[PDB]
Amino acid sequence: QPLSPEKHEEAEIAAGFLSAMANPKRLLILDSLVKEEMAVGALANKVGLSQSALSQHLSKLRAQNLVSTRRDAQTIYYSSSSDSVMKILGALSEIYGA
Amino acid sequence: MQPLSPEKHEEAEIAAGFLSAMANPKRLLILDSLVKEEMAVGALANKVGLSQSALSQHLSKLRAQNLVSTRRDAQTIYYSSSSDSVMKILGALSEIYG
């Protein structure tokens, strides 16, 4: 007996989310954004990558609804209050140590 | 301030490698099924709705991250997963998505 189409569709959603997290740079970004607010520059900095790129990851992270934004003048501050991201980071924390 | 240490980058690389092994819908269905049930390659391919080519591919990627165990009885290889990591991530996903 094959798996229902529902579990097939759920596997697609879950894998979409995990795909958003299954990148080292994105992992570092989400770590940083979970523990503090950052303007895009400082963030590109802490994770040690360039901003064409940092925009790269922020876009894929926004696609999975994993980050929040706030705007002061024309400066955007990113953060993450995602329960999903926090649960996965918790899991990884337990797997690899905190 | 201080960009992230090289060690946190290497930890992110490992963690992301693991998540990458899991960040595929087919691999999620496979690991869900294999936790913690022995299945032969044929039955697994039928359960996950795959041909032996894709299943071979997926299983190879799962073995690369040490996520599955095998046992051989004569002419049959039986697959399972007793991975603590896989179980923690599946637990998280269960709680995230119901």
- The CATH number of residue B60's host domain is 1.10.10.10
Half-sphere exposure of A91 (CA within 13 A, CB side): 26
Q: Which of B20, B46, B89 lies at the smallest CB-CB distance from A2?
A: B46
B68: tokens are 């599955």
> Which among A85, A95, A96 is the top mutation candidate for probing chain B, defined by the most B β-carbons within 10 Å of its own β-carbon?
A95
> What gap in Å lies between CA B4 and CA A17, rounded to an integer?
24
- Per the rule left: phi > 0, alpha: psi between -120 and 50, beta: everything else, A38 is beta
- Mark yes or no for CB contact B24/A1 under 8 Å: no
> Sign of the CA dihedral A55, A59, A65, A66?
negative
| Smallest Cα distance from B64 to chain A, Å | 16
Identity of the residue numbered B30: I
From which experimental method does this structure derive? Answer: X-ray
Are the beta carbons of A75 and A61 closer than 8 angstroms?
no
Q: Please name the residue of chain A whose CA is at the shortest distance from the CA of residue B47.
A: A2
> Which among A19, A36, A54, A92 is the top mutation candidate for probing chain B, defined by the most B β-carbons within 10 Å of its own β-carbon?
A92
Cα A73–chain centre separation: 25
Specified resolution (Å): 2.6
| Smallest Cα distance from B54 to chain A, Å | 16
Are the beta carbons of A68 and A80 closer than 8 angstroms?
yes
Are the beta carbons of B78 and B37 closer than 8 angstroms?
no
Please tell me what DSSP assigns to residue B80: E
Closest CA to B57 of B35, B91, B30: B30
Report the DSSP beta bridge partners of residue A76.
Answer: A71
> Which among B1, B93, B97 is the top mutation candidate for probing chain A, defined by the most A β-carbons within 10 Å of its own β-carbon?
B93
> What gap in Å lies between CA B98 and CA B96, rounded to an integer?
6
> What gap in Å lies between CA B11 and CA A68, rounded to an integer?
25
Give the domain range for residue B30.
1-98
Query: Considering its fold, how many domains does chain B have in total?
Result: 1
